[PDB]
């Protein structure tokens, strides 16, 4: 299983937020830690993406763009998996040192989004998503958001995305002789993948609004994140960059 061996091999390890859990919870501290954790994960998402089969085929400018557009969604999906495996969806496992209970979900002012991610977390269990399906679905997520005006080399991207879908087909067919069974599974997985997008959108909107008023609530945005929120996120929010839904 060359393809799956690679996905397993490059899967990022544990990333901590550096949050002070000995301090009473506050909006400013919780968000600063989410921001810092976001940036720490981006470092790994970039290394992960660049090590993915065929990613180098993409034009250099498209590589960066795709990573930045998919950043939020990729983190959402992996976070939901961690919440399921580590705490059976009882809380949201953003990081070992940044676990959200309902109180934190509320204090962060991201309650609706957190609840949707908890539901996603539960879905991993309800649908009995295997670790290999998770890995392949997450890679596919990276190739699920593009600009209307197109990428520099759209054809290369279309080929790569198609190949990742084919790998998902193979993983689904592995140990499934009945085509009907494969079809139902593909339906379930693509429906689950689609559900990630609306969640990332709510987080993008929240993050955008927060940055614009950051100086009013004492929230610290890392240099890199601020740039991406001000340059890339608005393209998504204004409809210039859109997710590719299956349904
Ligand atoms: C509020 C914020 O810190 C904003 O972080 C951003 C994350 C991504 C972008 N972006 O443009 O792709 C912008 C901002 C945040 O949502 N941070 C995090 C940090 C870690 C994780 C994880 N795991 C998550 C997520 F995805 F679970 F919501 C969110």
Pocket lining: 196 vs ligand 1, CB cutoff 6 Å:
no
Q: What is the CA radius of gyration of the chain?
A: 18
207 Cβ closer than 6 Å to some ligand 1 atom = yes
Q: Are 200 and 174 within 8 A, CB to CB?
A: no
Please tell me the distance from the alpha carbon of residue 81 to that of residue 88, in angstroms, as a whole number: 9
DSSP letters along 23-56, please? SPP-HHHHHHHHHHHHHHHHHHHHHHHHTSTTGG
Q: Phi and psi for 220 in degrees, rounded to 5?
A: -100, 115
Q: Which atom of ligand 1 is nearest to the CA of 35?
A: 3
What is the CATH classification number for the domain harbouring 141?
1.10.565.10
The method of structure determination was X-ray
CA neighbor of 68 nearest in space, from 39, 110, 91: 39
Helices vs strands, H then E, count in the chain: 11, 4
Alpha carbon of 244 to ligand 1 centroid (Å) = 20
Ligand 1 midpoint to CA 92 (Å): 13
Mutate to test the pocket of ligand 1, among 32, 75, 200 (most ligand atoms within 8 A of CB): 75
Phi, psi torsion values for 19, nearest 5 degrees: -70, 145
Residue whose tokens read 């085509």? 179
Q: Which two tokens stand for residue 178?
A: 């009945």
Nearest CA among 189, 191, 230 for reference residue 212:
230
Q: What's the number of domains the chain is made of?
A: 1
CB 144 within 8 A of CB 73: yes
- What is each CA distance from 140 to 32, 161, 165, 169, 201, in whole angstroms? 29, 7, 7, 12, 18
CB-side neighbour CA atoms (13 Å) of 246: 18
Give the DSSP letter string of 199-224: HHHHHHHHHHHHHHTHHHHTPPPPHH
Q: How many CB atoms lie within 10 A of CB 60?
A: 10
- What is the extent of the structural domain holding 148? 1-247
């Amino acid at each position: 299983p060359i393809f799956l061996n690679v996905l397993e091999a490059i899967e990022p390890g544990v990333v901590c937020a550096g949050h002070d859990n000995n301090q009473p919870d506050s909006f400013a501290a919780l968000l600063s830690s989410l921001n810092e954790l976001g940036e720490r994960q981006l470092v790994h998402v970039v290394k992960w993406a660049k090590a993915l089969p065929g990613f180098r085929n993409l034009h250099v400018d498209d590589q960066m763009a795709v990573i930045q557009y998919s950043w939020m969604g990729l983190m959402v999906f992996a976070m939901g998996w961690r919440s399921f495996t580590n705490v059976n969806s009882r809380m949201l496992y953003f990081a070992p040192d940044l676990v959200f209970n309902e109180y934190r979900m509320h204090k962060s002012r991201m309650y609706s989004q957190c609840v949707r991610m908890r539901h996603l977390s539960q879905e991993f269990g309800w649908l009995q998503i295997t670790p290999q399906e998770f890995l392949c679905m997450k890679a596919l997520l990276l190739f699920s958001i593009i600009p209307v005006d197109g990428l520099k080399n759209q054809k290369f991207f279309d080929e790569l995305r198609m190949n990742y879908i084919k790998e998902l087909d193979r993983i689904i067919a592995c140990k499934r002789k009945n085509p009907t069974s494969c079809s139902r599974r593909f339906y379930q997985l693509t429906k689950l993948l689609d559900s990630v997008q609306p969640i990332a959108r709510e987080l993008h909107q929240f993050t955008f609004d927060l940055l614009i008023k950051s100086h009013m609530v004492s929230v610290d945005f890392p240099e890199m994140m601020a740039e991406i929120i001000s340059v890339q996120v608005p393209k998504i929010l204004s409809g210039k960059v859109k997710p590719i839904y299956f349904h």
